[PDB]
Amino acid sequence: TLTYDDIVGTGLANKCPTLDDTARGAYPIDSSQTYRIARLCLQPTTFLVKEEPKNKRQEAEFVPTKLVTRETTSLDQIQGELKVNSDGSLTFVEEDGIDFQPVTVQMAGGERIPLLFTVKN
Amino acid sequence: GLPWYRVHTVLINDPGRLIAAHLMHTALVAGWAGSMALYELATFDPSDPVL
Numbered sequence A: 001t002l003t004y005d006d007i008v009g010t011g012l013a014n015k016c017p018t019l020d021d022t023a024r025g026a027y028p029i030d031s032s033q034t035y036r037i038a039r040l041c042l043q044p045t046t047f048l049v050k051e052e053p054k055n056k057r058q059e060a061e062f063v064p065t066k067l068v069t070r071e072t073t074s075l076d077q078i079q080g081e082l083k084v085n086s087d088g089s090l091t092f093v094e095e096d097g098i099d100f101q102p103v104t105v106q107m108a109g110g111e112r113i114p115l116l117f118t119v120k121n
Numbered sequence B: 001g002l003p004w005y006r007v008h009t010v011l012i013n014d015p016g017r018l019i020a021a022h023l024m025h026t027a028l029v030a031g032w033a034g035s036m037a038l039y040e041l042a043t044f045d046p047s048d049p050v051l
């Protein structure tokens, strides 16, 4: 278990927690108890931008991009209700957290694409 | 004196300054190539090799 000073400057602060290869279990849901997501973390590893072609009869593809705003991209400390629905499905309702990050990526040739990477609401 | 269309004949008997002049000419040609490529890169649109 690491402390801030073990972490600071390493880039680890922009990475979500992981689980081992042995974590292939199952978490029981008790339909009478209420549940919440105490922490949701989302760590982007690829940004792709759909090309905007002239012909408009070719299917446009998503192409790779270069991140230029450094290790500032992850969503974390997100929390909310985890409902158990009548049909046994679960619904997560986001309520709060660091749930947006501005991001600028660059396409081949230099065009910069800013976006608000988010899962708000 | 030498008329204007003969000024470069001073190099005929001067191998070293002939090499200098050839070096300067080579410098200008290579410089044109570099500048020409930069100008084309500053104006080329790479987004559509089809049309």
Ligand code: CLA
Pocket: B004, B005, B006, B007, B008, B009
């Ligand atoms: C490798 C090519 C080459 C070289 C090294 C020479 C070298 C020479 N020439 Mg020859 N010549 C050539 C090709 C060449 N010539 C070609 C293609 C033609 C037909 C156009 C001639 C017709 C010719 C004539 C009629 C005479 C020479 C003369 C001479 C001597 C004097 C040149 C001088 O002082 O000019 C000085 C030139 C100026 C001060 C200004 C010239 C301005 C030009 C015309 C306009 C702009 C040119 C521009 C920068 C060129 C860009 C490059 C181009 C290839 C794209 C010198 C030995 C003279 C000689 O025999 O003296 C005894 C002479 O009377 N040449």
Ligand code: CLA
Pocket: B002, B004, B007, B008, B010, B011, B020, B021, B022, B024, B025, B028
């Ligand atoms: C490859 C090009 C080249 C080279 C290596 C030489 C080399 C030589 N020249 Mg020649 N000359 C050239 C082109 C060249 N010349 C051209 C194009 C002209 C017509 C203007 C002349 C006219 C000329 C004369 C009248 C004389 C020489 C002479 C000589 C000898 C002494 C140097 C000198 O005085 O130059 C002087 C030449 C210049 C300073 C040429 C500069 C003119 C151009 C237009 C400059 C442009 C550069 C600028 C940064 C770009 C403009 C871009 C535009 C969009 C604004 C040396 C062997 C001398 C010599 O020894 O006589 C016995 C001499 O008296 N040259």
Ligand code: CLA
Pocket: B015, B018, B019, B022, B023, B026
């Ligand atoms: C060792 C044998 C040797 C070699 C390898 C060369 C090579 C060359 N000579 Mg020749 N030359 C030689 C013997 C040789 N020469 C002898 C014994 C004489 C009688 C003196 C001549 C008389 C002669 C004349 C009058 C001229 C040449 C020119 C040239 C060049 C034309 C190509 C050019 O400029 O490309 C473009 C250049 C490059 C791609 C870069 C090359 C980088 C060089 C090789 C590094 C230089 C470092 C080195 C210590 C400098 C001395 C080199 C010298 C041995 C050539 C080329 C480098 C012409 C020239 O120099 O034009 C500018 C020219 O006008 N030579």
Ligand code: CLA
Pocket: B008, B025, B028, B029, B032
């Ligand atoms: C195979 C390739 C090749 C060859 C053989 C030559 C040969 C020559 N070049 Mg070079 N050049 C080349 C490629 C070449 N060039 C390239 C790719 C560039 C980059 C664009 C240059 C840029 C260049 C410059 C800047 C200069 C030369 C010059 C010269 C001449 C030097 C010897 C001399 O005194 O001529 C005496 C001159 C002549 C015999 C007249 C040549 C006339 C040509 C063939 C066409 C002229 C067109 C028109 C009358 C004037 C131009 C119109 C104007 C509105 C621009 C010689 C004719 C020099 C020169 O001409 O000095 C006076 C010079 O200043 N060249």
Ligand SMILES: CC1=C(/C=C/C(C)=C/C=C/C(C)=C/C=C/C=C(C)/C=C/C=C(C)/C=C/C2=C(C)CCCC2(C)C)C(C)(C)CCC1
Pocket: B028, B029, B030, B031, B032, B035
């Ligand atoms: C010194 C030095 C350096 C720098 C360099 C440089 C920067 C260069 C440049 C160069 C250049 C930048 C060059 C250019 C050139 C150009 C040219 C040479 C051109 C010419 C032209 C012409 C000749 C034309 C003609 C004509 C006309 C005008 C019209 C139409 C017709 C014709 C085409 C004829 C370095 C850093 C490396 C280091 C070492 C030292």
Ligand SMILES: CCCCCCCS[C@@H]1O[C@H](CO)[C@@H](O)[C@H](O)[C@H]1O
Pocket: A109, A110, A111, B041, B042
């Ligand atoms: C020795 C000259 C070096 C100059 C290099 C400039 C960067 S390279 C330059 O970058 C632009 C924007 O990314 C592109 O649009 C263009 O196609 C490319 O040539």
